Amino acid sequence: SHEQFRAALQAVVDPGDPRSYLDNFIKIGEGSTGIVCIATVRSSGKLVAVKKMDLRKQQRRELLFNEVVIMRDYQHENVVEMYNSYLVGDELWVVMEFLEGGALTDIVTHTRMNEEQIAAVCLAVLQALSVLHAQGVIHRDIKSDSILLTHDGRVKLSDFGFCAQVSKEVPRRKSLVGTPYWMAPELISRLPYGPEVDIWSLGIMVIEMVDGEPPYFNEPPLKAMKMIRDNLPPRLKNLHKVSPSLKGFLDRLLVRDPAQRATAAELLKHPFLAKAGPPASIVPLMRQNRTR
Numbered sequence: 001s002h003e004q005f006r007a008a009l010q011a012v013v014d015p016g017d018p019r020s021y022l023d024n025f026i027k028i029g030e031g032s033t034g035i036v037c038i039a040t041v042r043s044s045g046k047l048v049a050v051k052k053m054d055l056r057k058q059q060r061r062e063l064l065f066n067e068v069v070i071m072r073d074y075q076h077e078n079v080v081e082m083y084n085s086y087l088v089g090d091e092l093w094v095v096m097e098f099l100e101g102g103a104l105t106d107i108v109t110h111t112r113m114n115e116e117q118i119a120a121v122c123l124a125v126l127q128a129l130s131v132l133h134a135q136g137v138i139h140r141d142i143k144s145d146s147i148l149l150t151h152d153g154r155v156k157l158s159d160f161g162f163c164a165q166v167s168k169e170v171p172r173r174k175s176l177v178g179t180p181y182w183m184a185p186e187l188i189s190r191l192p193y194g195p196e197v198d199i200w201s202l203g204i205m206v207i208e209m210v211d212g213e214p215p216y217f218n219e220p221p222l223k224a225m226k227m228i229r230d231n232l233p234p235r236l237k238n239l240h241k242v243s244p245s246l247k248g249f250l251d252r253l254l255v256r257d258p259a260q261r262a263t264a265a266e267l268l269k270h271p272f273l274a275k276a277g278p279p280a281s282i283v284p285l286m287r288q289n290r291t292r
């Protein structure tokens with residue numbers, strides 16, 4: 001019953017209607033759970049983003065609860081700040097920070113990132129992931145689309161709609177969740193899994209940043225998963241174009257056996273990350289500075 005779920009949700013969200021203090025909604029994007037508008041706080045002129053998820057157009061609508069679990073409990077500097085959540089009509093609305101340097105997908109699609117810039121992205125995702133993983137939270141949809149930048153070039157994780165939680169009582173997850181190309185093979189094999197699955201997907205994102213797209217991006221989703229499961233770790237299209245120090249890094253990420261994969265915390269001490277630049281090194285890549 002759609003109505004029963006709307007009622008369940010009302011019990012966990014902030015009361016009211018944000019359209020009472022917001023002005024001039026403009027669509028800026030779409031995910032798989034919903035769309036993203038920006039609005040203007042009416043009194044102050046600050047901008048915010050509002051994530052709009054229709055309750056009737058979800059694969060599993062119980063995952064919508066993840067938005068509020070994360071907003072309540074797992075806020076952190078390398079994670080998007082989510083301010084309030086409402087039930088509006090038949091939609092859930094999350095008001096959050098507007099990350100105005102946009103998504104990393106736009107950068108990888110049109111640009112050639114260098115290793116200083118790649119290393120800064122990787123560092124900041126791994127800061128986030130170690131902290132989350134230590135609390136047993138697995139993100140489960142790591143990809144360029146999930147990484148947002150501020151105008152001044154600081155990297156934050158987004159799109160926690162598919163995340164899940166592990167612990168002594170529930171030590172592994174079993175669900176088939178994410179975006180096919182970035183899925184870890186243990187996950188595709190339906191092994192029970194842990195946070196190691198985010199480390200694999202980060203690798204795939206490294207390859208995004210190096211090659212421009214993930215492995216097997218030309219096959220339909222179903223066939224490429226078969227491919228990930230069977231064949232060995234995918235190779236850079238452009239192996240010759242990467243320092244041995246970054247090959248050394250990717251090699252610790254794209255391990256098929258989850259037990260021998262690196263952890264977010266171990267990978268923080270890997271030498272490839274010493275090359276990380278500041279935030280400012282990423283600013284040139286953004287569409288508003290790229291051609292200028």
Ligand SMILES: CNC(=O)c1ccc2ncsc2c1
Pocket residue numbers: 028029030036049080096097098099100102103148158
């Ligand atoms: C393609 N753009 C986007 O999807 C986008 C951009 C900024 C932002 N700030 C909070 S959510 C969010 C999404």
